[PDB]
């Protein structure tokens, strides 16, 4: 009956554990990401030539 959650800290990182195993915030695949503590989840720095 109208449940809500708020996964609030997507620092996370991939975890290939099953669905009913995980913590919150983790994710199943994360490419080119960067999970800082205060700022949440950024696109990675852009590789200056």
């Amino acid at each position: 009956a109208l449940i809500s959650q708020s996964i609030k800290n997507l620092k996370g990182g991939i975890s290939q554990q099953p669905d009913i195993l995980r913590y919150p915030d983790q994710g199943s695949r994360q490419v080119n990401g960067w999970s800082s503590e205060t700022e949440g989840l950024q696109k990675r720095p852009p590789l200056v030539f």
Partner: protein, 239 residues
């Protein structure tokens, strides 16, 4: 602003600081005294950001006009930049001088009103005290060791307050998405430092309100606590 702090050391409870203007290089003393008086005189420890104890010389008072001419390169070492200058007397007389448009190099004068033959005059800058509270929302303690704050739902604020203890005058600015409010707070209606609870209304979404406190007016300020009072209907549940 435009002032470079180029050292900092601290003997036991006195932080001696040299600090560079765009014209000079100073030396100072930040004393962590609680109710004591910095310079000899000074009836209430005037928060002044620079603090001389000057005696007005003989020839400054034009007999035609009403003001005296105090020259700020003489009461200090040399010139200044820009800032708001407050002049305090052994009475409760507080005169605030605004900065000139070019600023304290085109107009190095300080037009104190009255007849000042010789009398202890305390002149200084003004502190720019700024503090924001936080974005007000539900903050409940998650069983002894973490603070998880509650995001789901709309929290419509009604009021807020600032508990102050033996403090002066201050201004609780409240900003919104497209609005502005000032909410001054006078004395205890001399000095009249008060020890009450100023209760100001903030109305909005609490995700867009932002309350911030200013104070410039030379008096101490002791914010010992705050708190708010919202509505918070939630169209969901927990589990």
């Amino acid at each position: 602003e435009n002032v470079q702090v180029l050292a900092c050391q601290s003997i036991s409870s006195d932080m001696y600081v040299i600090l560079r203007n765009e014209f000079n290089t100073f030396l100072a003393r930040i004393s962590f005294t609680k109710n004591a008086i910095d310079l000899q005189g000074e009836p209430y420890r005037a928060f002044m950001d620079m603090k001389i104890r000057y005696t007005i010389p003989s020839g400054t008072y034009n007999d035609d006009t009403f003001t005296t001419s105090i020259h700020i390169p003489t009461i200090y070492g040399a010139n200044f930049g820009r800032g708001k200058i407050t002049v305090l007397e052994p009475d409760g007389k507080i005169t605030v001088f605004e900065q000139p448009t070019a600023g304290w190099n085109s107009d190095p004068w300080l037009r104190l009103s009255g007849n000042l033959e010789g009398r202890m005059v305390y002149i200084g800058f003004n502190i720019n005290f700024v503090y924001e509270f936080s974005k007000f929302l539900i903050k409940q303690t998650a069983d002894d060791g973490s603070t998880s704050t509650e995001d789901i739902g709309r929290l419509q604020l009604r009021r807020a307050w600032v508990n102050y203890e033996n403090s002066g005058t201050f201004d609780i600015y409240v900003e919104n998405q497209s609005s502005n409010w000032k909410y001054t707070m006078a004395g205890a209606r001399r000095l009249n430092l008060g020890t009450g609870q100023y209760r100001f209304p903030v109305v909005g979404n609490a995700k867009f309100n932002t309350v911030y406190i200013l104070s410039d007016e030379t008096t101490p300020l002791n914010i010992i606590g705050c708190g708010w009072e919202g509505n918070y209907l939630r169209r969901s549940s927990g589990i």
